[PDB]
C-alpha cells in the first residue's frame, strides 16, 4: 500500500512522500509519459516499471510489512506479491536517498505538457 511506501519515503529522505513526490517531474506520481526530467524523475520511471512486473498485484492497496536492521530496509514474508512489491519500494526509496542532493523544485507540481517522449521500460 501507498502506506508503507511514503512511511519508507520519509524515513528515508524525511520529506513526506504527498507533496514532495507525488508530483514531481514526469513521473513521480502520475506515470504516463515522457522522458524522466531527473535522478529522482528516472527513480520513479524504474519505480513505475517495477510495479508494471507484477501485473496480477495491486501496489496501491496490498500492505506488506518491513523492519530496519540498523538502517537496511527489510522485507517481510508475505505473499509473493507483497515481497515483490516490497522490494520495487526499497528500490524507490534508496534511489531518491541517493539523489536528494539533486532533488529540484523547479519539477514540483510539473506540467504534463513538457512530458513527451518515449520510453520503454
Ligand atoms: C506501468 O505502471 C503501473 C502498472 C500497473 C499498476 C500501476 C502502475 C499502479 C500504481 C499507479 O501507477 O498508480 C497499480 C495499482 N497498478 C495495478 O494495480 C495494475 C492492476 C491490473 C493491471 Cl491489468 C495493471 C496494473
Ligand atoms: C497512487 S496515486 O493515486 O497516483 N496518488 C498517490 C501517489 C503517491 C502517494 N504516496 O504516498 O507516495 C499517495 C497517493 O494517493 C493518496 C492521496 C491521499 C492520501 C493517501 C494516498
Known amino acids: 500500500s501507498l502506506l508503507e511506501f511514503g512511511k519508507m519515503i520519509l524515513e528515508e529522505t524525511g520529506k513526506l512522500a504527498i507533496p514532495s513526490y507525488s508530483s514531481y517531474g514526469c513521473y513521480c506520481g502520475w506515470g504516463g509519459k ?3 526530467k531527473d535522478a529522482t524523475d528516472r527513480c520513479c520511471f524504474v519505480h513505475d516499471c517495477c510495479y ?3 501485473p496480477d498485484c495491486n501496489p496501491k492497496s496490498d500492505r506488506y510489512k518491513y523492519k530496519r536492521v540498523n538502517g ?3 522485507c517481510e514474508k508475505g505473499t509473493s506479491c507483497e515481497n515483490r512489491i516490497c522490494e520495487c519500494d526499497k528500490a524507490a526509496a534508496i534511489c531518491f536517498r541517493q539523489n536528494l542532493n539533486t532533488y529540484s523544485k523547479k ?3 510539473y506540467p504534463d505538457f513538457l512530458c513527451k517522449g518515449e520510453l520503454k521500460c
Open 52 to 54: 508494471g512486473n507484477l
Open 72 to 74: 537496511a530496509i527489510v
Open 107 to 109: 519539477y514540483m507540481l
Open 34 to 36: 515522457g522522458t524522466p
